[PDB]
Design an enzyme around this catalytic site. Structure first.
Site, PDB file in Angstrom:
ATOM      1  N   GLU A  53      11.768  22.742  27.832  1.00 23.15           N
ATOM      2  CA  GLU A  53      12.657  23.642  26.776  1.00 23.15           C
ATOM      3  C   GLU A  53      12.231  23.569  25.599  1.00 23.15           C
ATOM      4  OE1 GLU A  53      16.113  21.572  27.865  1.00 23.15           O
ATOM      5  OE2 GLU A  53      17.089  23.323  29.043  1.00 23.15           O
ATOM      6  N   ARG A 232       4.199  38.219  37.454  1.00 19.80           N
ATOM      7  CA  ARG A 232       5.654  38.805  37.153  1.00 19.80           C
ATOM      8  C   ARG A 232       6.233  38.088  36.193  1.00 19.80           C
ATOM      9  NH1 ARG A 232       7.789  42.925  39.604  1.00 19.80           N
ATOM     10  NH2 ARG A 232       5.900  42.924  41.043  1.00 19.80           N
TER      11      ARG A 232
HETATM   12  C1  LIG Z   1      24.136  22.093  35.168  1.00 21.11           C
HETATM   13  C2  LIG Z   1      23.084  22.860  34.734  1.00 21.11           C
HETATM   14  N1  LIG Z   1      23.129  24.307  34.731  1.00 21.11           N
HETATM   15  C3  LIG Z   1      22.301  25.218  34.529  1.00 21.11           C
HETATM   16  C4  LIG Z   1      20.718  24.754  33.956  1.00 21.11           C
HETATM   17  C5  LIG Z   1      20.093  25.893  33.611  1.00 21.11           C
HETATM   18  O1  LIG Z   1      18.711  25.933  34.291  1.00 21.11           O
HETATM   19  P1  LIG Z   1      17.493  26.596  34.009  1.00 21.11           P
HETATM   20  O2  LIG Z   1      16.498  26.855  35.264  1.00 21.11           O
HETATM   21  O3  LIG Z   1      16.923  25.691  33.019  1.00 21.11           O
HETATM   22  O4  LIG Z   1      17.960  27.892  33.113  1.00 21.11           O
HETATM   23  C6  LIG Z   1      20.691  23.232  33.943  1.00 21.11           C
HETATM   24  C7  LIG Z   1      19.400  22.707  33.078  1.00 21.11           C
HETATM   25  N2  LIG Z   1      19.476  21.397  32.705  1.00 21.11           N
HETATM   26  C8  LIG Z   1      18.216  21.015  32.351  1.00 21.11           C
HETATM   27  C9  LIG Z   1      18.397  19.525  32.222  1.00 21.11           C
HETATM   28  O5  LIG Z   1      19.514  19.021  32.784  1.00 21.11           O
HETATM   29  O6  LIG Z   1      17.409  18.781  32.014  1.00 21.11           O
HETATM   30  C10 LIG Z   1      21.784  22.441  34.061  1.00 21.11           C
HETATM   31  O7  LIG Z   1      21.568  21.189  33.947  1.00 21.11           O
END
Ligand SMILES: Cc1ncc(COP(=O)(O)O)c(CNCC(=O)O)c1O
Ligand SMILES: Cc1ncc(COP(=O)(O)O)c(CNCC(=O)O)c1O
Lengths: 405, 405
Positions: A53, A232
Site C-alpha cells: 500500500e 488486464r
Molecule cells: C479486514 C480487511 N479487509 C479488507 C482489506 C482490504 O484488502 P485489499 O486487497 O488490500 O484491498 C484488508 C487489508 N489489510 C491489509 C493489512 O491488514 O495488512 C483487511 O485487513
C-alpha cells in the site's frame, strides 16, 4: 505449465480448453488482444505475495525496495510512452481508474457530461446501473444522425446548458478520431475539468496513430489490456498539479494493496510498446481495420460512420434486416467472435441491438494481414446473407479453420 | 522463467531480487503469505486475454464456455469451504468486496457501525480518507481498555444510539476470536444488516479454527490472499436472498471485466484449502502464533489482549519505551519484517504508534514450527531490548540468517 496439471486437473483442463479456443476461433471482440509470454510470466510471479500500500519510497510496509523499482519502471515507461507529467499504475481495472478520477474531482450528485451510451459511451460513463450514474448526475452528448461523428455543437450546447463539473470524452464503440482540442475548448468555456478515457485507443495513441489526449486533458484514464496489449488492469495519467490528489484517490481512497505482479506485467507491456515493432504492429491494426471495413462494404454492409479511423468498426445490420443478437449468434456457430452493439439512434434495445462491433487488434497480433481481412469479410458476407443455410455455415466454418490452421 | 529474462532484463532483475528477498527475510507481516506454484501458474495463464463481464452462463461476450467452468469451480469450491448459499469470486480486492456490499445495502450518507480503526478496524471500515468514511456516516465500537477484547455492551449501546443500517464486524488487527452470534443478536435488535469482513481469518475459518461468520451474517467479505493463502483479490459470500443484488453490485455496479486468470488462481487456492493438509497447516499457524506470543511474553513483552486466539499478535511496546515506528525500523535492520500498528487507546498517532503487529501465516507456510517461534521471539527480545547496540544487531542478523538458510 508444471505444477497446475498435477495439483488441479479440473482447473488445468479448463485453462487448456481456453488456450486452444483462443487459437481456433477468429477473435474480433474490439476490446481483446493476446499478451506476450513475458507479460504472463510477470503476472505469474512471486510479486503477488507482497503487500505494498502507498507508493514507491512512501509505502506503509517495509520490504518494498524491489517492488518499488517495478512500480517506477511502469510509471516512467508510461510517461515516456504518453508524455504525461504523472502516472498512477495501480488501478485494478478501467472501471477503478475512472472511479478514482471521479472520486478526485466530483462530489456526490455533481453533473458530468459524457458520450451517449447508445452512441459509443462506456458503462462507466453514466449508466444508471453503474456507480457513475448512481453517484453522479450524467448528461450526454451525441453523434450526428447521418455521419455518426460526434456533434461538437451538441457537446458545447449540453455543456453550456447543464454546466458539468467534468466532461468525459472517449468511448467503447466510436470508430473515428476524437478531437480532444475541441473537447478542451468547450471545457474551458464552461469551467469544467476534461477527462479522456482512452482505454480502447491507448495503443494507437502510443504508436502515434491517434492524437494524444495528454496535452489537452486534465486527466487521462485507460485500461492496459486493449490496443495497448498489456495485462488486464487500469492506469491514470494526469498533470503534476493533480498528482497527489489522484494518488490519494487510488490509495487510501478507493483501493487497498495494489497487484504488484500485474504492475510488473504493465511495465513489461509498456517496454514492448516503446519498441519500434509495436509501432509497426499498431499501424497494421489500423490498416487491417480500414481494409476489413472496405471489404465489408464490398460485401454490401453498411458501416456506422462509413468506415473507421482506428481499430474498430460497427456494422449497421438494418439493411440485412438482422439484429446484432442474431448476427452474433450465427457468427458464433462458425467460429467468429463479435459482439452485438447498439448503433447510434438504434431502434432496438441494448440487449438486442441493430449492430455488431468488430476490432482487429487481436487478429493483427496473431499475424493476420490485408488478405486475411478480405477473407474474414467474405466469410461474414456468406454467413449474414445466408443465415438459414446450413451449407453456407459449414463452408464458413471450413474457411475459418483454414485461417486459424 | 524463460521469456521475461530476455525481453525485460530490468523487470526480471527486480523480480528476482524480490524472490530472493522473500527467502532471506523473516516475514511477519500478518496479512502476507506465500502462494503455491500452481496458484502462480493459474495467474500467469492466457485467461488474462478474455473479456467476461457478467456471470457464468449469463455473460455479455460469446466464447466464455471455458472461463465459465473456471468461475463455477471457484464459486462451488468456495461454497464447500465456507458453506455459504452464494459466492461472488469477481471482487478485484478486499476493498472492492467491501465497496460492493456497501453499494448493495447503503445509500450515500447512511450510518454504519464498525470497529474503531485504532482498536483493530480496517481502513475500509470508515476511515475518513477512504471511500467508506467519505460516502457513509461511520460510528465505531471499541474494545475494553484492560482486556482489549471487543466490548459487546459498547457495540450494543452504539447500535441502539446511532441506529446504523449496517453493522460491520471483523478486523485487520484483532488477536482474539470474534463472537458473530452476539453481533447478529445486536443487529437484529436494531434492525441492521450484519456484514463480517473475515479477510484476515478466512483460512482459519476454512480449517475450523475460528467460528464461521456465514450462518450469522447477511454478507461475508474477504480477501483471498491472507490466511486463505490464495492469489491477491476479494470475494463476497452471502445468503441466496441477496445473491442477485450482490452480483449486480459487482457488475454492472462497481467493476467491469473480471480478472479470469486471478479467478482461476482463486479456484486453485480453494482446492488447496479443501485438502486435509491445509487444515494441518492452519492449526500450525495458530499453534505457532500462540507459541510466539508465549515466547515473547517470556522475553518480557506485553501483548495486546494478553496473547492470541488466531494468526496474529500485537506487542504493546510502552514498557520498553519504544514506538512501533522505532521497533519496525530496527527489526528491518536485522532482516525481520513487521509493521507498526496502533494499539487500543494508543497515545501516539497512527504514523508513529506504540505497537508492532506480527502474524505467523507466512513463516508457517515456509515450514517454521514451535522451535523457530521460540528463536524468533528470542531474536526480537535481543534487538528491542538493545536498540543502541550494533553488536546485538549483528548477532540478530546472524541468527535470522541461520533460520532462513
Ligand atoms: C479486514 C480487511 N479487509 C479488507 C482489506 C482490504 O484488502 P485489499 O486487497 O488490500 O484491498 C484488508 C487489508 N489489510 C491489509 C493489512 O491488514 O495488512 C483487511 O485487513
Ligand atoms: C472506454 C472504456 N473504459 C473503461 C472500461 C472498463 O475497463 P475494465 O477493465 O473492464 O473495468 C472499458 C471496457 N470496455 C470493455 C469493452 O469495450 O468490451 C472501456 O471500453
Amino acid at each position: 505449465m508444471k505444477y497446475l496439471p498435477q495439483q488441479d486437473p479440473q482447473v488445468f483442463a479448463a485453462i487448456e480448453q481456453e488456450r486452444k479456443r483462443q487459437h481456433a476461433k477468429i477473435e474480433l471482440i474490439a476490446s481483446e488482444n493476446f499478451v506476450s509470454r513475458a507479460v504472463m510470466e510477470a503476472q505469474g510471479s512471486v510479486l503477488t505475495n507482497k503487500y505494498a500500500e502507498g507508493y514507491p519510497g512512501r509505502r506503509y510496509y517495509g520490504g518494498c525496495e524491489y517492488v518499488d523499482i517495478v512500480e517506477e519502471l511502469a510509471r516512467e515507461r508510461a510517461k515516456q510512452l504518453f508524455g504525461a507529467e504523472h502516472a498512477n499504475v495501480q488501478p485494478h481495472s478501467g472501471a477503478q481508474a475512472n472511479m478514482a478520477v471521479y472520486f478526485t474531482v466530483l462530489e456526490h450528485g455533481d453533473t458530468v457530461l459524457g458520450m451517449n451510451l447508445s452512441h459509443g459511451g462506456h458503462l462507466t460513463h453514466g449508466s444508471p446501473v453503474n456507480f457513475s450514474g448512481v453517484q453522479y448526475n450524467f448528461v450526454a452528448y451525441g453523434v450526428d444522425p447521418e455521419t455518426h461523428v460526434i456533434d461538437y455543437d451538441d457537446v458545447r450546447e449540453k455543456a453550456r446548458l447543464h454546466r458539468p463539473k467534468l466532461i468525459v470524452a472517449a468511448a467503447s464503440a466510436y470508430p473515428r478520431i476524437i478531437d480532444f482540442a475541441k473537447f478542451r475548448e468547450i471545457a474551458d468555456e464552461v469551467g469544467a475539468y476534461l477527462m479522456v478515457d482512452m482505454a480502447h485507443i491507448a495503443g494507437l495513441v502510443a504508436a502515434g496513430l491517434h492524437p494524444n489526449p495528454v496535452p489537452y486533458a486534465h486527466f487521462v484514464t485507460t485500461t492496459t489490456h486493449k490496443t495497448l496489449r498489456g495485462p488486464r488492469g487500469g492506469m491514470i495519467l494526469c498533470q503534476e498539479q493533480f498528482a497527489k490528489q489522484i494518488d490519494k484517490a487510488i490509495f487510501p481512497g478507493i483501493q487497498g494493496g495494489p497487484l504488484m505482479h500485474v504492475i510488473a506485467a504493465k511495465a513489461v507491456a509498456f517496454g514492448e510498446a516503446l519498441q519500434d515493432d509495436f509501432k509497426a504492429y499498431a499501424k497494421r491494426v489500423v490498416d487491417n481495420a480500414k481494409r476489413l471495413a472496405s471489404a465489408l462494404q464490398n460485401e454490401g454492409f453498411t458501416l456506422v460512420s462509413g468506415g473507421t479511423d482506428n481499430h474498430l468498426l460497427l456494422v449497421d445490420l438494418r439493411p440485412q434486416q438482422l439484429t446484432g443478437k442474431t448476427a452474433e449468434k450465427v457468427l458464433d456457430e462458425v467460429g467468429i467472435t463479435v459482439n452485438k452493439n447498439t448503433i447510434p439512434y438504434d431502434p432496438e434495445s441494448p440487449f438486442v441491438t441493430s449492430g455488431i462491433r468488430i476490432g482487429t487488434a487481436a487478429v493483427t497480433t496473431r499475424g493476420f494481414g490485408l488478405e486475411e481481412m478480405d477473407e474474414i469479410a467474405a466469410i461474414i458476407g456468406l454467413v449474414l446473407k445466408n443465415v438459414g443455410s446450413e451449407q453456407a455455415l459449414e463452408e464458413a466454418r471450413q474457411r475459418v479453420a483454414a485461417l486459424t490452421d
